[model samples]
Target chain A: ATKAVCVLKGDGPVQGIINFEQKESNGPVKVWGSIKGLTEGLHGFRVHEFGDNTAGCTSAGPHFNPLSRKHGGPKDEERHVGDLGNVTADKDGVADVSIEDSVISLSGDHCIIGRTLVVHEKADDLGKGGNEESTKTGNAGSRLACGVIGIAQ
Target chain B: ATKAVCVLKGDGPVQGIINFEQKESNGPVKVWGSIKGLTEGLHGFRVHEFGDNTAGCTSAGPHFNPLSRKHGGPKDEERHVGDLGNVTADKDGVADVSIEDSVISLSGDHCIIGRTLVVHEKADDLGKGGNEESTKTGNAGSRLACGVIGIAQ
Candidate 1:
């Protein structure tokens, strides 16, 4: 499939771009971009189920958990499809992100079109907690910013 | 005051960064940034009164008209404080912007903190129209993307 992108926005000084790229089946999907105006530390990053911003980021619904699995780190096999973990910001409040994942698909059932990509105010708690119902929303705190994922030319 | 920044987001591929800066009183407020994923050519640029993206860009409300003026180009003294005119996108759908304005302020009555900066899908009609109510919303079409103006740390 082709490239997909998201535009992040915040109530204050938070914003940036996030891009997704995958060239072939079974290959790792590459994610990268520079998010500006964050605090100097780690921030939660996730793919949400809805793209609507009618009531702000709260309108985005839950994480992209197609299989209804428990929350964990990005690399965990049992993790949610949206669990891409945390992105660290430099002293300049900019996060330079680049990572690869094997789970998310640009097409088929795992398609992320019309979804939302959100950045949280705090770090997401990772680790394969026992219960799917007991797992927290990564404890990611408030929504800093979000954008609807879209197809790129 | 320090630089104010914004992150533009869209329902589709449109997105980018916009910045506002001023170093002294009465100096021009310099506006500049790079926006990505636009259709080629001119698009309306304006500052809406609110930064709330609750109902998407529509929630940003009307052009920031502190003095309740008629619509015109960025250079026109009769234009709204929010009327920034247009920005041109290249074949690659990217717009590198740079310009300065005399009416906008980082502080005082004209201060633009916590407002919205929007890019429209078409060029705004310039020229001081006769009646404030008769002036079309610049006749600029749909909102492409927008970001909240914020204080830079």
Candidate 2:
């Protein structure tokens, strides 16, 4: 989606473009993006429960955990479809990464067409931080930026 | 469209179902809902900007005011599509309200699918409270309940 990036009601300067491409049957979904104006470090990125941007990034809800599973890494068999793991920013506060994810889809039960992409203020521990929030949210902090995932023609 | 009712996370004794039906032609969309566990008075209700339930109803964003208009009653000519005004509860803490809205729709530019419905802690002043929030949010207090609107089939 093309819109100004919002950092908790325009508190910070952050912007980026992420793209999702659907491959052939059973192939991994390709996810990639380049973001700026974030802290120079690892940040949690994931799909959220709803694509609603009405209330800012928070309105995107929690991680897209449709299976009712615990929080884990993108490669874990038992994880939220929204979990894309951490994206690392360089010294210039830019993050660009690409991966083939098996857990997400462009259609079917795990289709993310109408969901949301949320970038967090802190690193997602990927369920290994040994805390309650880690179990549910991977210890990701406040939302830094978010946008709805839309279908591209 | 239908949606799951949302209450303050960890706040107990609040639950209900809200449903929307589209009648034939240009008739107003029918909205009916029954809720329990609220103060015995009027409460603000609106369609939020986003359908996200990630961070509770607060994540549902602000009112679904796509037209960039001022906050007003649902029947107003220049208002957000989400400005549904108030719902009242009785001494027993139950609220059941049904109304036909002229501005909302199941299809077309005003479609409400994938939006959120939020029940507030206080009544909506309908922009007559002479305050900034009244103009932007109708002076509704904290959100007590929220749900995402979904297609029935």
Candidate 3:
């Protein structure tokens, strides 16, 4: 059994915590996280392609799309494995989320061992854009915060 | 009717040009792009969420899933509206794709006024990955290159 942790940080004004726990070598991975310092609204949340946050968030690359899929919500079966969907902030500027992902694992080709988690500035429309951008990245706004997934002791 | 264009610029070793044209106010937008400097094989291509390139490609956000649907191929009715499917890069490292997206438009909520176009480093699994990232970002690798969708003459 192994677990992972990520401490979210932002360049402007955002902070959060993400935790990952693997109960079995080939079982579902549980994910939970909380974020603060965001406007009261829906925010896009995802696991980026790389874990290297040396450049602060943007350098972490695109979403961790191992199947080269489009972005969708966490409940959608045919969505990005890294697409954890949105996290809503309250009037206090805080958001929290909990997920038991059937797709994400700590082993095999889908292992998210060294990836980066990101929080967008705006809500993810879930790919139903009436325009060109809607089909690509959900038109989620800026990268308000980010953190690298690391193995937890 | 309105048209848009994107001048792709690679982050790795990639480059391309994408063009969008809408002849009718309520018709499928026509998309055609000629991409170069890619590895011989397949690649994932789609319109992202934002037109803001202030922070480069990653800032574009997730796939354009506006209907809050799942990720799917270009032909699936239940798929993300932005799921344009795969682009085959021939042995010459060039891929040209032409698409008539039914769910996309130039007016109303479907308008793609301020969005982005992104080319992935790998082929999209079309939401068939047994893993999580599959349905999310189509398991596409890094954001090799990107371009913003802008009104055209």
Candidate 4:
């Protein structure tokens, strides 16, 4: 029930091309990745909590709710426990993903570790609200990229 | 349609808190912004056609494709018009978004104006791939942050 190791390197100078790795599986938890500097096609992703980086993707500020529900459709009835949904990047920027959130808590209380990761120039209407709360943010507006959610081992 | 103003101030000393300007109105032509400053949780965005930062976000690669196809599901049956998807942030990092691309093309076949902006610690895969492919990026992994997609005046 405890084993963490996350490695998503490739910043500033874009090292190793682009990478992401998650270790800790029981049944659902698989993500061993690579997103080689992009430019191929199809892009957008999620997993937010907040780190207060000023505005580096709004500094991870929204999807950790704790239990304050309003933004719907993760399978709605009242969602927001840090909805683990969305991701895409396939043209060359390359997108290799894997998902699963038993309620996601990398550590203590819903631990998202540092929290903050976004990418959206457009796309994420998974809930069908048609934008402006059509699920809050699946209308996928614009916030074209960001990152922060560390603690892998 | 000429109106530009791209800002992201907060060089760092500790004083960055922007998150509440999320816009999305596609009646005129184009508008996309995602500040997410104050840092609270989740950040991952995109707007790459090529502006070459050359390293980290690879000057922003991918998206704005001429047409290739295969990263389906925004409502997929056969995606790739340069699939734009996933952008969620709310804990506080912010997630201001806006869009207007009904096949937007200012000239050169359309869609490519100072592009390059990315961020990802992990959170993408919408393609029914397990943990990889929230939809598309379940295969191209990593690069936890990048930027470039400008035009402000």
Candidate 5:
């Protein structure tokens, strides 16, 4: 009940493992994982609406926002619950993600379990970009990989 | 990926988790988990078609059968890939499940990630019962709890 995990995979060489942990209800969730076979740069990390993998990343729908909020940065006071910001890859094409987030949960109606974790091909603009797509998806381009978030152990 | 996990939950007192692990492709998957607050004796356990939890266990369609087989025991040669047989609950209302299964996979076309895991109210007859409903669901009654399968850390 205190932790969760997602195994990220796509139609290509990208692969990863994302882990989430919360010490108590409404507490900060510790997020960490290592994504591999990615380009040397930032990639958007988000929790999509569905865990359905029927069509790979396309079936994930959009960023989860059960609270009916607009999209923004993971640290923004105004943002979708699924707005996890981005992850940076090293020169070896590997990204080691680690952070403490407060917008999501492991339990309750807004729990992130049973949802898909997406790694995008570009960095999320955190809703600051002037383009219309910026507010919706932060203009984070195509999906690179995704996996369902489930209980850890 | 070598492993996956599901956090089984419902609109009742039932709570638990089911884990799947495979050492290699096409190898036996190690299944284990502990369900609590269950009624005494056996309960049917199976994987459903979707990880969609929009309506709780009700949204988790029928048993996963990518091979287009009938519902049967985990050991049966003609059972659904999601046919996981039954788990026995002790007097304390806890079921400690552990098994080595060959019918499911953690990777490839039939990879089980992004699906639902359901625990039923009654034991699965393993399709041997002399009833019309036996072949479809082994006559396993109502669903008590369910969860979506995701990549395990």
Candidate 6:
């Protein structure tokens, strides 16, 4: 398929971009985005299932786990299907990280079209067993922020 | 056109549900999710551009800014296109929110496909001076976490 690229402007809130391109025949999806409006430190993030943009953050549904799997860790062999891993913020609270999703698909079945993007106050444990589902990063600690993913204008 | 919902899941990520009927319209997008690993407090969130899911939050770019305006407060008269305002997290680190975009379609022109979602540490200044250019709130802040948006299968 043709390579798709997206860019987000620095509106009154935050600004950045996201790019997508099909990789090898059998590989994870390549994705990335630019971020701002943070505390200039490290933050946790993930792709959720529902898009319930509530007043605070508890609007989105569980992770995009069409499979109905229990929340685990990124490398935990067992975790939310939406768990791709983790990202860190710079001293400026800015992050420009990249990752590949083995379960996420732009066209196939496990699509995440209408989903929520969440930011956390703490970091995800990646299912390392920190304590409460540490494997699931304990829900990333707290809901620092959230947003919905939409088509490019 | 339907109301696109943004949901925050417990999988350390957020989600969006851009429901559309085109004809009669099924119903507004109902976003719903869990706040898996987060704290109990209020947070910030917004729809951003870019949809690259990678190691860090770079895959998702800045906020969606089709207007190409400067960065400031949401209430500010002058702002970028991606400024849809902010969302907060409840005591349980969960939130449910919704909004309508008359200018664009959820999955079409107004679509945020190939975009990224972001969360902030503190609250927005709502368009006030004294705001840093690219730091503090102006800096876009740190990339607590992120997710890529795309068409569902």
Candidate 2, residues B1-153, lDDT tens digits: the string is 322222222145665666667765466778786888988999898887765554556666778876788987766776788888898899999999787787877566676665667788889988888988888888888888765554342
TM-score of each: 0.52, 0.53, 0.50, 0.27, 0.56, 0.47
Chain A TM-score compared with the true chain A, each model in order: 0.92, 0.90, 0.93, 0.29, 0.96, 0.74
| DockQ per model, Cα | 0.03, 0.04, 0.01, 0.02, 0.10, 0.14
- List ranges where model 2 is wrong by over 4 Å: A2-153, B1-12
lDDT against the true structure, per candidate, is 0.77, 0.71, 0.74, 0.44, 0.83, 0.52
Error of 4 at A50 (Å): 7.6
Clashing pairs in 2: A52-B50, A52-B51, A54-B49, A54-B61, A54-B62, A55-B61, A58-B59, A59-B59, A61-B54, A62-B54
* Residue-level lDDT for B97 in candidate 6: 46
Model 1 reproduced share of reference interface contacts: 0.00
CA error at residue A57 for candidate 2, angstroms: 25
What lDDT is reached at residue B110 by model 6? Answer: 47
Error of 4 at A20 (Å): 6.4
User: Local error of candidate 5 at B5, Å?
Assistant: 0.6
Model 1 lDDT per residue over A87-112, tens place: 99999999999988888866556766
Candidate 6 chain B lowest-lDDT run of ten:
B19-28
Cα displacement (Å) at residue B31, model 4:
3.0
lDDT of 1 by residue, B11-38 (tens): 9889998878898766778989899899
Worst 10 residues of 4 chain A by lDDT: A10-19
Model 4 C-alpha lDDT versus the unseen true structure: 0.44
Model 6 ranges with Cα > 4 A deviation? A2-15, A23-27, A54-56, A136-139, A151-153, B1-153
Error of 5 at B79 (Å): 0.7
Question: Between which residue pairs do clashes occur in model 1?
Answer: A54-B54
